[PDB]
Amino acid sequence: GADGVGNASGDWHCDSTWMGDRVITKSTRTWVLPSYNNHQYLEIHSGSVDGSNANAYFGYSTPWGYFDFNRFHSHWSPRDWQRLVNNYWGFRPRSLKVKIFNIQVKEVTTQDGTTTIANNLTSTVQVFTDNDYQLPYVIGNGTEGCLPAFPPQVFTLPQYGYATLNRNNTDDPTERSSFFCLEYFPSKMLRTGNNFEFTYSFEEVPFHCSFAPSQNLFKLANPLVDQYLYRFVSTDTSGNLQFQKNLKARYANTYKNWFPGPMCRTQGWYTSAGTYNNKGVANFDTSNKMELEGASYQVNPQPNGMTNTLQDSNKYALENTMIFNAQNAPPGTTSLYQENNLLITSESETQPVNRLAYNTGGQVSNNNQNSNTHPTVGVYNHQEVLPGSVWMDRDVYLQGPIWAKIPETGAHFHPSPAMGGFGLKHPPPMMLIKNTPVPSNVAAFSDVPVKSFITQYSTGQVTVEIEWELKKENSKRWNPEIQYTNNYNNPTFVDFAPDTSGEYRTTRAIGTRYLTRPL
Amino acid sequence: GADGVGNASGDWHCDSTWMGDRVITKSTRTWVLPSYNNHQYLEIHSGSVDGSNANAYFGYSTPWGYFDFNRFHSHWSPRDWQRLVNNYWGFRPRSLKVKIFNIQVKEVTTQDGTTTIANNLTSTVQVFTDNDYQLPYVIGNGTEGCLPAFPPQVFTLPQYGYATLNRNNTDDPTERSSFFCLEYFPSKMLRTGNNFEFTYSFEEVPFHCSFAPSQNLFKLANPLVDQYLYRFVSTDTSGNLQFQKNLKARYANTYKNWFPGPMCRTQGWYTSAGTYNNKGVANFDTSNKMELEGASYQVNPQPNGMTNTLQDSNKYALENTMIFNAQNAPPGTTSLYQENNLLITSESETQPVNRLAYNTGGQVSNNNQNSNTHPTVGVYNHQEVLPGSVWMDRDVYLQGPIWAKIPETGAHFHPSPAMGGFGLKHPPPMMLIKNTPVPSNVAAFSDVPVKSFITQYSTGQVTVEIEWELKKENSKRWNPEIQYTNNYNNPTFVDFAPDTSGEYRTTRAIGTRYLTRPL
Amino acid sequence: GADGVGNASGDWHCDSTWMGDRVITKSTRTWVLPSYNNHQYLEIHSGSVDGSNANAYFGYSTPWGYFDFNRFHSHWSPRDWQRLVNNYWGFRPRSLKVKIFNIQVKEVTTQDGTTTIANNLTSTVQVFTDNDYQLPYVIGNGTEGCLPAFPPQVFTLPQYGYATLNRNNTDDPTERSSFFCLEYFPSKMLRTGNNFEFTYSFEEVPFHCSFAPSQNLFKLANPLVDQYLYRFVSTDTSGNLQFQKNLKARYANTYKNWFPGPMCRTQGWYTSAGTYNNKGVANFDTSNKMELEGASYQVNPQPNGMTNTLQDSNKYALENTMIFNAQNAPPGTTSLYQENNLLITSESETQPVNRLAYNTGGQVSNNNQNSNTHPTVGVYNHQEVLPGSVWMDRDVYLQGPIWAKIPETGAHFHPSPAMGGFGLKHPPPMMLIKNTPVPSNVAAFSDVPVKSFITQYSTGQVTVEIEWELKKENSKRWNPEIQYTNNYNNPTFVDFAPDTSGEYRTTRAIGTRYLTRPL
């Protein structure tokens, strides 16, 4: 932008603007960027870890870092989120603007145990966006490093890396393994006066459904009126078939037009009461898994179409659950966490249309009845998509992801990501940034590449603006709705606020489904 | 319409008009409307009934009643239906017009065991349509109360009620239970001179397929020509692999492009011969079921994609069958019915592409073969939608439903209702009507609402006009087709006609699939 | 309107329409009108009753009845009210439309213990509005007879009567007592085809404040900074004056710009725990009272400016409280009611700016200090309006009144009615209606007025439409707000819904103050 050393290249924008059918969120944060890998690209790999060869991989770490705004709380204050979920039947993203500005590059020198930091006014950072999706898209896998929830917090940009193909579930590559060089893209170079701006339009995507059903999928018939349909009930002692009319309100017997969503049975576990759970279990051997390339992988939180719990029940299908930490956690922690440390979400709103993850799905005939053979049924633990099936996709959370990239295979079905949010063919592109290397003193020629660099890091601001489209509520429900509310019994701190040490406290996961609709 | 006491507000229209690619049906009937619940809204509920807690519910009954034209015989005479199904490959509804007129409100007084009926010229009825689908949509669940099949028959409008959510499969409500007040809508008020008119356009929907396949899905290859493809046949005594060419007409061995529809195995039962059936069976424990919200429900007639019987066979998968009564039945009857009382439909036309409901679906490899281990297979009793699968949706019947509302969840697959007919996102809206309350003598003030009303009922005519689009047959079949025909051996009455007592007799269910097409 | 016998003169309108800054409510109800006093005007009076001569009065009852829509639930469904109070900082009425239509006049004859009811097609009702406020305005005194909360309920119009002046607190009139004849106004006469319409604009009036303060009136100073002001603290042993700086956050000592509202101390009583209350008290002798014309009257709920309770406390100043019945009650009941029968409102939201009704207001110096005389203070139990005082007026409730007429005296202060709502100089005018008398058989002349009339009553519909202006919330609060929500533990019925007998159940009083604002 050529603002120059003494002129700011942008202003602080954090706001929300509510229009009748649209809302515009604006978020600004301060970032800091290390020089990762000391300006080197490094092959990274691993064999089997923790007794699973699904943990083997081959890939690369890069000197670059990237901006990740793919969580709802990056854009939405808690109050704004409340206003959203209490009043609207749905929402979707429409457009995006990003600005990176007020660049400051610092040099670091260490001498005799003391560290000195100074401006380097002539250094650059490099920024580009991968508009054609030519790089592995690591955004939307639920990884850390997003713009923080709380605007004053200063955050470190995560390092860009990726896994390509590995051979036979080992740490070796294959002939098809790809290396991607990020310097092989055009990128803008910014000194301290320069800035970067980017605009993007979302593709057409369905509204997220921010309502809960007020009817049960199998109870849709008028309770006052019989069906004109008849069901087989019994055989008499001579084997003749006997039938009965399907009476009003007998929902066990009514013919059905529509069927519940697909399910994969998932083990149920009791929360807050240990005495009901089986003691000293190691989950991993009995976890739900899918096989790929000769290895077994955990598939949490299972495909869409189930509910992980019943309302006002302490039993959860944990592998069907999005589980968040109430606090930020250090990288690499292996510590065991307990329920009170975590935010365990509930999909219970969808229980009228989604099957319960920890029960059987149903039963079908498994034999051929005859004079000597009584009819029998088998139960089933999984059932995939059926003609005429309906379900609700997983809810989104203030703490949760927004979008995910639909993999490019040429074939898919119902592209809504398991974690929740908007499946996108062309998502917001990766935004990559790195500190340009500055060599240190070099006296003599060599054909060997320079390895010795001045230690530098950079800092600046980033602004993200998203236009959201809203779907208005159009309910005729007479009695009041359930609404998210700030109710606490004798609080010692304000939730969604900094505490006495300045830590931002969040003790609840807030979903979107409060208002109701009939089916 | 302000016609006035002595002027009719509409005329009787029952006709059909056949245009080349369209047909317009017009139906007029006389209705009678009780004052249900004596102008009160009543909470209705139930616990477990007949040993099933799937029969528990919570809901409301309303003073309103509603017009239900959602059966084919409301619009189609038997002869017209014959003309449709013998000559056309498909049809779909396009537009709708409804008129309610010639309102007559009667007051009823009972004194000393004698009942007197008189006109009340100044009373009103109230009518409205739920255009935004803001109320539970109870139409399209197969319940009674439709416009009668036979035009002179006078019918009672059914009472509007609905089930909302209940708690833990009991008779209690939950926090999410909805109460809907129908007086919270604008509605037109009609005295005896007034009328009501409504028009509606159907959304684009696929033609119903009124043909049967003349080829088997697995027999599509030219019987005169070998495939250029080879199959594994055996291993020799040294374990070497052996292969053979797939020969002409060997349809057991041909490679396949396409696969049959999804299936859920359903128990088969013999009709008209009791000796083959298992004696004294109570079906309910061994019925097919699906689990929802912690309860088990019968899912008849199963999802689309199966056939319930084979042509010229007496074995039926009864829970895969639409079963109608030949006669109208009284409300609430628990009597046992026998086969000769009922119309048991057959989907046998689809047997070349739909799998047979009472057999296994197939078999797949269940182990890993090696030097010491012979290959084995398991059979499967259910198989859901596969890539490249094809099937035919259930046929529609003169006696059967027309449309159903697709539930509003944001996610579904192949929205064609299990019962048969057209799945609609925005179906013809509920048309609701009630007798406006007229208080009786009130001498003194009270803040308590008036409970004492003059007993009234109303009667009038309703006309429904539907424009249907037709898909012309374009067959090159040389030999004659199967056609629905009026063939009876020594009849003692005319079918689809009133008998000596005036009862309208219908002894057959008439489907649509007579003409054939190659695949 | 001259619709005629067989033509409806209006339609049913109950709806709400939400525009961005305005909301339009439309309500329609069915009414029934007795012929009160058999078409006679009657002097009514009373002496001392229950030992209080404040109960003496002189006045008149009229044959007329009147429409009273002066309660919020006449216009607002519970869900709509929820939407209002959760999202907006205020509202006020703007315009009004009323229609009376579908008139039906019935004649009643009783013979041998049996009652017969028939239409009288040629009878009239008479309607007029008192546009110039020339009659005693009885609307807005908290009396029964309003349009019901629940739209299907049919209600009886209350009888119009009024009290004029009485002599010396007895049952006699004075020379200044006024008799008002309602037939001395022009009025429209309606047969069964006719209707009546009226439109009205509200005067400019302040928005009701639908928010609660998030700051305490005495805590407004920055807690991080000292005042530059000093306070007298002590005298030393020689009598010299000593002073100290007012330190940061010491809100006991800070100089104040502003002062709390006016108060009248009111006795506090414990709810739900009887053991803390004084036993067997008769309240009336110790009630708060004001004297007028030589008699003593209870002044509940006291003037504005107090709070009746503290948050999460069981102590209430009951005479400072609006107390509603959860149910409709019969006229004239003397039964004792208990807390669980009643809705006891809480003004606790205003506790940061309004003084607590059951404590003392403060203390002031009551003597002159000197060498021999220690300073003393008296406490005070009442304090009226002070310069620089601020307070919040009483909240409004879904169950409560909307407006009140400011008395016409030429002098008043802060005209907001004690009960809550909008003080209006020219409120919506009285709407009066009566059944025109129809004499019975008269054979001979007399100069004495006819006393013998055919017994008649009338019924019809009334529609009321109000345009409301809204004040949008403009909060920067980061953390979530308190919101009214439909939370019930194991409900056996749906609140704000009809129960199994059809009774409309309301177990909560819903105020407007949920959102917060800083001072």
mmCIF file of N, CA and C in Angstrom, chain A residues 214 216 219 222 226-228 230 233-235 237 239 243-245 250-253 255-258 311 351 355 361 363 365 368-371 377 384 388-389 391 474 476-479, chain B residues 50 55-56 134 140-142 144 159 164 166 176 178-179 184 265 267-268 275 277-279 281 283 286-289 291 293 298 300 321 323 325 332 334 337 384 405 409 411 413 418-419:
data_model
loop_
_atom_site.group_PDB
_atom_site.id
_atom_site.type_symbol
_atom_site.label_atom_id
_atom_site.label_comp_id
_atom_site.label_asym_id
_atom_site.label_seq_id
_atom_site.Cartn_x
_atom_site.Cartn_y
_atom_site.Cartn_z
ATOM 1 N N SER A 214 -40.730 -29.940 16.405
ATOM 2 C CA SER A 214 -41.744 -30.062 17.446
ATOM 3 C C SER A 214 -42.664 -31.264 17.239
ATOM 4 N N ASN A 216 -42.612 -35.702 16.276
ATOM 5 C CA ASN A 216 -41.897 -36.948 16.058
ATOM 6 C C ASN A 216 -42.198 -37.507 14.670
ATOM 7 N N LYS A 219 -44.996 -39.933 14.394
ATOM 8 C CA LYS A 219 -46.268 -39.524 14.977
ATOM 9 C C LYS A 219 -47.048 -38.521 14.129
ATOM 10 N N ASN A 222 -52.854 -37.689 12.170
ATOM 11 C CA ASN A 222 -53.852 -37.061 13.028
ATOM 12 C C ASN A 222 -54.278 -38.035 14.122
ATOM 13 N N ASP A 226 -58.700 -42.641 12.362
ATOM 14 C CA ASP A 226 -58.134 -43.926 11.964
ATOM 15 C C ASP A 226 -57.498 -43.840 10.580
ATOM 16 N N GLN A 227 -56.575 -44.752 10.303
ATOM 17 C CA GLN A 227 -56.170 -44.942 8.919
ATOM 18 C C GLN A 227 -57.194 -45.802 8.180
ATOM 19 N N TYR A 228 -57.260 -45.623 6.865
ATOM 20 C CA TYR A 228 -58.017 -46.507 5.992
ATOM 21 C C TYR A 228 -57.197 -47.720 5.584
ATOM 22 N N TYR A 230 -54.878 -51.339 6.687
ATOM 23 C CA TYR A 230 -55.000 -52.504 7.549
ATOM 24 C C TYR A 230 -53.657 -53.209 7.643
ATOM 25 N N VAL A 233 -51.952 -59.043 11.551
ATOM 26 C CA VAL A 233 -51.798 -59.162 12.993
ATOM 27 C C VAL A 233 -51.464 -60.587 13.413
ATOM 28 N N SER A 234 -52.212 -61.577 12.950
ATOM 29 C CA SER A 234 -51.962 -62.927 13.433
ATOM 30 C C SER A 234 -52.387 -63.958 12.396
ATOM 31 N N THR A 235 -52.073 -65.216 12.688
ATOM 32 C CA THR A 235 -52.684 -66.362 12.038
ATOM 33 C C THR A 235 -53.503 -67.106 13.076
ATOM 34 N N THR A 237 -55.619 -70.718 14.376
ATOM 35 C CA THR A 237 -55.110 -72.068 14.592
ATOM 36 C C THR A 237 -55.091 -72.886 13.309
ATOM 37 N N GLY A 239 -54.051 -71.424 10.469
ATOM 38 C CA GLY A 239 -53.096 -70.755 9.621
ATOM 39 C C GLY A 239 -53.666 -69.675 8.735
ATOM 40 N N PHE A 243 -56.264 -59.751 10.135
ATOM 41 C CA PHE A 243 -55.896 -58.362 9.921
ATOM 42 C C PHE A 243 -56.707 -57.467 10.850
ATOM 43 N N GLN A 244 -56.179 -56.276 11.122
ATOM 44 C CA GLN A 244 -56.905 -55.267 11.879
ATOM 45 C C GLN A 244 -56.684 -53.885 11.288
ATOM 46 N N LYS A 245 -57.681 -53.035 11.471
ATOM 47 C CA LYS A 245 -57.589 -51.644 11.069
ATOM 48 C C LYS A 245 -56.588 -50.912 11.958
ATOM 49 N N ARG A 250 -52.635 -44.745 17.270
ATOM 50 C CA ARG A 250 -51.773 -45.875 17.598
ATOM 51 C C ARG A 250 -50.571 -45.768 16.678
ATOM 52 N N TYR A 251 -49.540 -45.109 17.180
ATOM 53 C CA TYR A 251 -48.443 -44.780 16.294
ATOM 54 C C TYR A 251 -47.489 -45.947 16.162
ATOM 55 N N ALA A 252 -47.597 -46.930 17.044
ATOM 56 C CA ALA A 252 -46.867 -48.170 16.853
ATOM 57 C C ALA A 252 -47.287 -48.867 15.562
ATOM 58 N N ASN A 253 -48.563 -48.763 15.185
ATOM 59 C CA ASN A 253 -49.107 -49.519 14.062
ATOM 60 C C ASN A 253 -49.339 -48.729 12.780
ATOM 61 N N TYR A 255 -49.112 -47.080 9.232
ATOM 62 C CA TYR A 255 -48.268 -47.010 8.050
ATOM 63 C C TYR A 255 -47.488 -45.700 8.045
ATOM 64 N N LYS A 256 -46.259 -45.752 7.548
ATOM 65 C CA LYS A 256 -45.338 -44.623 7.533
ATOM 66 C C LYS A 256 -44.992 -44.234 6.108
ATOM 67 N N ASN A 257 -44.939 -42.934 5.835
ATOM 68 C CA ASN A 257 -44.362 -42.483 4.575
ATOM 69 C C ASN A 257 -42.852 -42.321 4.641
ATOM 70 N N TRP A 258 -42.312 -41.973 5.799
ATOM 71 C CA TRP A 258 -40.942 -41.500 5.868
ATOM 72 C C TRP A 258 -40.174 -42.252 6.948
ATOM 73 N N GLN A 311 -32.724 -36.334 25.602
ATOM 74 C CA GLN A 311 -32.921 -35.182 26.470
ATOM 75 C C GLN A 311 -33.024 -35.612 27.927
ATOM 76 N N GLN A 351 -33.528 -35.573 18.369
ATOM 77 C CA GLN A 351 -34.001 -36.912 18.697
ATOM 78 C C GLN A 351 -35.344 -37.277 18.062
ATOM 79 N N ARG A 355 -32.000 -41.185 14.783
ATOM 80 C CA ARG A 355 -31.975 -42.347 15.654
ATOM 81 C C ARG A 355 -30.883 -42.239 16.710
ATOM 82 N N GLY A 361 -30.739 -50.155 15.582
ATOM 83 C CA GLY A 361 -31.518 -49.335 14.673
ATOM 84 C C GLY A 361 -32.916 -49.862 14.435
ATOM 85 N N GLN A 363 -35.107 -53.908 13.453
ATOM 86 C CA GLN A 363 -35.049 -55.345 13.228
ATOM 87 C C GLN A 363 -35.768 -55.696 11.934
ATOM 88 N N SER A 365 -36.844 -59.316 9.272
ATOM 89 C CA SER A 365 -37.036 -60.759 9.175
ATOM 90 C C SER A 365 -35.755 -61.452 8.741
ATOM 91 N N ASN A 368 -37.494 -67.856 6.969
ATOM 92 C CA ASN A 368 -38.690 -68.141 6.179
ATOM 93 C C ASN A 368 -39.666 -68.968 7.012
ATOM 94 N N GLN A 369 -40.760 -68.351 7.443
ATOM 95 C CA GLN A 369 -41.764 -69.042 8.248
ATOM 96 C C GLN A 369 -42.540 -70.094 7.461
ATOM 97 N N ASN A 370 -42.941 -71.155 8.150
ATOM 98 C CA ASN A 370 -43.741 -72.230 7.563
ATOM 99 C C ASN A 370 -44.460 -72.980 8.689
ATOM 100 N N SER A 371 -45.137 -74.077 8.365
ATOM 101 C CA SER A 371 -45.878 -74.860 9.353
ATOM 102 C C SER A 371 -45.016 -75.220 10.554
ATOM 103 N N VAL A 377 -36.613 -62.602 13.779
ATOM 104 C CA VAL A 377 -36.045 -61.339 13.327
ATOM 105 C C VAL A 377 -34.612 -61.226 13.823
ATOM 106 N N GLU A 384 -27.699 -47.731 6.395
ATOM 107 C CA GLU A 384 -27.280 -46.577 5.620
ATOM 108 C C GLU A 384 -28.505 -45.914 4.992
ATOM 109 N N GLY A 388 -36.604 -42.309 0.850
ATOM 110 C CA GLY A 388 -37.550 -41.719 1.772
ATOM 111 C C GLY A 388 -37.043 -41.521 3.182
ATOM 112 N N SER A 389 -35.739 -41.465 3.387
ATOM 113 C CA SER A 389 -35.208 -41.213 4.716
ATOM 114 C C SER A 389 -34.998 -39.720 4.928
ATOM 115 N N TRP A 391 -33.380 -36.812 7.964
ATOM 116 C CA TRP A 391 -32.546 -36.663 9.148
ATOM 117 C C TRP A 391 -32.164 -35.197 9.273
ATOM 118 N N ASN A 474 -40.795 -17.938 11.060
ATOM 119 C CA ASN A 474 -42.152 -17.657 10.610
ATOM 120 C C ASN A 474 -43.101 -18.603 11.333
ATOM 121 N N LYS A 476 -46.097 -19.973 13.944
ATOM 122 C CA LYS A 476 -47.386 -19.753 14.598
ATOM 123 C C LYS A 476 -47.524 -20.429 15.957
ATOM 124 N N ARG A 477 -46.463 -20.989 16.507
ATOM 125 C CA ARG A 477 -46.528 -21.518 17.864
ATOM 126 C C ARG A 477 -47.076 -20.473 18.835
ATOM 127 N N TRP A 478 -48.070 -20.867 19.638
ATOM 128 C CA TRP A 478 -48.718 -19.931 20.554
ATOM 129 C C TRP A 478 -47.908 -19.730 21.833
ATOM 130 N N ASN A 479 -47.470 -20.810 22.459
ATOM 131 C CA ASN A 479 -46.752 -20.733 23.722
ATOM 132 C C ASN A 479 -45.279 -20.382 23.512
ATOM 133 N N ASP B 50 -51.659 -51.302 24.474
ATOM 134 C CA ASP B 50 -51.399 -52.597 23.840
ATOM 135 C C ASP B 50 -49.963 -53.058 24.071
ATOM 136 N N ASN B 55 -47.066 -46.112 21.390
ATOM 137 C CA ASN B 55 -48.413 -45.565 21.305
ATOM 138 C C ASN B 55 -48.637 -44.385 22.246
ATOM 139 N N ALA B 56 -47.662 -44.025 23.070
ATOM 140 C CA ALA B 56 -47.816 -42.847 23.918
ATOM 141 C C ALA B 56 -47.681 -41.577 23.089
ATOM 142 N N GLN B 134 -47.526 -23.515 8.520
ATOM 143 C CA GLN B 134 -47.214 -23.156 9.888
ATOM 144 C C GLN B 134 -47.867 -24.075 10.912
ATOM 145 N N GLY B 140 -52.032 -36.634 4.207
ATOM 146 C CA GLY B 140 -50.999 -37.466 3.634
ATOM 147 C C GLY B 140 -50.397 -38.472 4.577
ATOM 148 N N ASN B 141 -51.091 -38.812 5.649
ATOM 149 C CA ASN B 141 -50.721 -39.915 6.518
ATOM 150 C C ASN B 141 -51.645 -41.120 6.394
ATOM 151 N N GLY B 142 -52.512 -41.145 5.391
ATOM 152 C CA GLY B 142 -53.357 -42.300 5.165
ATOM 153 C C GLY B 142 -54.578 -42.393 6.052
ATOM 154 N N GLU B 144 -58.562 -41.475 7.376
ATOM 155 C CA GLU B 144 -59.900 -41.410 6.814
ATOM 156 C C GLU B 144 -60.397 -39.969 6.701
ATOM 157 N N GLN B 159 -62.167 -34.203 12.240
ATOM 158 C CA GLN B 159 -61.707 -33.212 13.207
ATOM 159 C C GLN B 159 -60.189 -33.047 13.163
ATOM 160 N N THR B 164 -47.795 -33.386 19.249
ATOM 161 C CA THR B 164 -46.507 -32.743 19.424
ATOM 162 C C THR B 164 -45.587 -33.694 20.201
ATOM 163 N N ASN B 166 -43.750 -35.738 23.163
ATOM 164 C CA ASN B 166 -44.024 -36.241 24.502
ATOM 165 C C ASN B 166 -42.726 -36.655 25.183
ATOM 166 N N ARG B 176 -40.268 -28.485 24.793
ATOM 167 C CA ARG B 176 -40.338 -28.144 23.385
ATOM 168 C C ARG B 176 -41.703 -28.403 22.761
ATOM 169 N N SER B 178 -45.264 -27.923 21.346
ATOM 170 C CA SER B 178 -45.904 -26.751 20.775
ATOM 171 C C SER B 178 -47.417 -26.851 20.884
ATOM 172 N N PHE B 179 -48.048 -25.752 21.277
ATOM 173 C CA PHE B 179 -49.482 -25.579 21.120
ATOM 174 C C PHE B 179 -49.751 -24.581 20.003
ATOM 175 N N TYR B 184 -55.587 -18.020 15.656
ATOM 176 C CA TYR B 184 -54.510 -17.037 15.514
ATOM 177 C C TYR B 184 -54.077 -16.813 14.054
ATOM 178 N N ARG B 265 -35.511 -57.255 4.392
ATOM 179 C CA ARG B 265 -36.243 -58.508 4.305
ATOM 180 C C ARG B 265 -37.488 -58.474 5.183
ATOM 181 N N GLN B 267 -41.149 -60.755 6.269
ATOM 182 C CA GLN B 267 -41.632 -62.130 6.338
ATOM 183 C C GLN B 267 -42.728 -62.405 5.309
ATOM 184 N N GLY B 268 -42.621 -63.539 4.620
ATOM 185 C CA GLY B 268 -43.627 -63.959 3.656
ATOM 186 C C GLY B 268 -44.694 -64.844 4.274
ATOM 187 N N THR B 275 -52.691 -73.886 5.385
ATOM 188 C CA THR B 275 -51.934 -75.040 5.848
ATOM 189 C C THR B 275 -50.430 -74.815 5.744
ATOM 190 N N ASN B 277 -48.899 -71.808 6.362
ATOM 191 C CA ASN B 277 -48.511 -70.835 7.384
ATOM 192 C C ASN B 277 -48.289 -71.433 8.769
ATOM 193 N N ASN B 278 -47.415 -70.810 9.555
ATOM 194 C CA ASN B 278 -47.173 -71.247 10.924
ATOM 195 C C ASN B 278 -48.441 -70.914 11.707
ATOM 196 N N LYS B 279 -48.919 -71.845 12.522
ATOM 197 C CA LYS B 279 -50.152 -71.637 13.293
ATOM 198 C C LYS B 279 -50.068 -70.777 14.563
ATOM 199 N N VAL B 281 -49.737 -67.469 15.354
ATOM 200 C CA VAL B 281 -48.662 -66.498 15.505
ATOM 201 C C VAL B 281 -49.255 -65.147 15.853
ATOM 202 N N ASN B 283 -48.152 -61.481 15.304
ATOM 203 C CA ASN B 283 -47.144 -60.882 14.434
ATOM 204 C C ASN B 283 -46.266 -59.867 15.149
ATOM 205 N N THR B 286 -42.518 -60.208 16.173
ATOM 206 C CA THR B 286 -41.613 -60.505 15.072
ATOM 207 C C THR B 286 -41.768 -59.579 13.866
ATOM 208 N N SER B 287 -42.499 -58.487 13.996
ATOM 209 C CA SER B 287 -42.645 -57.539 12.901
ATOM 210 C C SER B 287 -41.331 -56.801 12.615
ATOM 211 N N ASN B 288 -41.183 -56.299 11.390
ATOM 212 C CA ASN B 288 -40.112 -55.343 11.135
ATOM 213 C C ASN B 288 -40.361 -54.068 11.929
ATOM 214 N N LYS B 289 -39.298 -53.499 12.488
ATOM 215 C CA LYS B 289 -39.426 -52.312 13.322
ATOM 216 C C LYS B 289 -38.208 -51.417 13.162
ATOM 217 N N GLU B 291 -36.268 -48.151 15.510
ATOM 218 C CA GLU B 291 -36.177 -47.511 16.813
ATOM 219 C C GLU B 291 -36.119 -46.002 16.645
ATOM 220 N N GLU B 293 -36.329 -42.424 19.376
ATOM 221 C CA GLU B 293 -36.527 -41.849 20.702
ATOM 222 C C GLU B 293 -36.729 -42.889 21.799
ATOM 223 N N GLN B 298 -43.572 -50.087 14.147
ATOM 224 C CA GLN B 298 -43.762 -50.745 12.862
ATOM 225 C C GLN B 298 -43.629 -49.746 11.721
ATOM 226 N N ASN B 300 -44.394 -50.398 8.270
ATOM 227 C CA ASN B 300 -45.141 -50.704 7.044
ATOM 228 C C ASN B 300 -45.433 -49.451 6.215
ATOM 229 N N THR B 321 -46.913 -54.515 1.966
ATOM 230 C CA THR B 321 -48.123 -54.434 1.156
ATOM 231 C C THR B 321 -49.044 -53.304 1.610
ATOM 232 N N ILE B 323 -52.667 -52.469 2.141
ATOM 233 C CA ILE B 323 -53.852 -53.294 2.350
ATOM 234 C C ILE B 323 -55.048 -52.385 2.599
ATOM 235 N N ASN B 325 -59.450 -51.870 2.721
ATOM 236 C CA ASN B 325 -60.729 -52.520 2.953
ATOM 237 C C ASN B 325 -61.617 -52.313 1.737
ATOM 238 N N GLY B 332 -62.870 -46.902 15.009
ATOM 239 C CA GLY B 332 -62.447 -47.592 16.211
ATOM 240 C C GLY B 332 -62.656 -49.088 16.251
ATOM 241 N N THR B 334 -62.139 -52.868 16.433
ATOM 242 C CA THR B 334 -61.072 -53.810 16.741
ATOM 243 C C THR B 334 -61.305 -55.197 16.159
ATOM 244 N N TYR B 337 -60.324 -58.969 10.663
ATOM 245 C CA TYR B 337 -60.740 -59.053 9.277
ATOM 246 C C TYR B 337 -60.024 -60.211 8.607
ATOM 247 N N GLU B 384 -28.921 -51.245 1.615
ATOM 248 C CA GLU B 384 -29.431 -49.916 1.337
ATOM 249 C C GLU B 384 -28.930 -49.456 -0.032
ATOM 250 N N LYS B 405 -46.349 -34.698 2.357
ATOM 251 C CA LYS B 405 -45.453 -33.584 2.626
ATOM 252 C C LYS B 405 -44.083 -34.111 3.019
ATOM 253 N N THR B 409 -36.679 -31.042 7.592
ATOM 254 C CA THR B 409 -35.481 -31.257 8.390
ATOM 255 C C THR B 409 -34.199 -30.684 7.813
ATOM 256 N N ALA B 411 -32.481 -32.231 5.549
ATOM 257 C CA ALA B 411 -31.766 -33.329 4.893
ATOM 258 C C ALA B 411 -32.707 -34.495 4.622
ATOM 259 N N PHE B 413 -33.312 -38.017 1.448
ATOM 260 C CA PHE B 413 -32.864 -38.703 0.236
ATOM 261 C C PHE B 413 -34.027 -39.361 -0.507
ATOM 262 N N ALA B 418 -43.329 -43.600 1.063
ATOM 263 C CA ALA B 418 -43.411 -45.060 1.107
ATOM 264 C C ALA B 418 -44.765 -45.619 0.691
ATOM 265 N N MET B 419 -45.827 -44.908 1.045
ATOM 266 C CA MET B 419 -47.191 -45.308 0.696
ATOM 267 C C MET B 419 -47.504 -45.227 -0.802
#
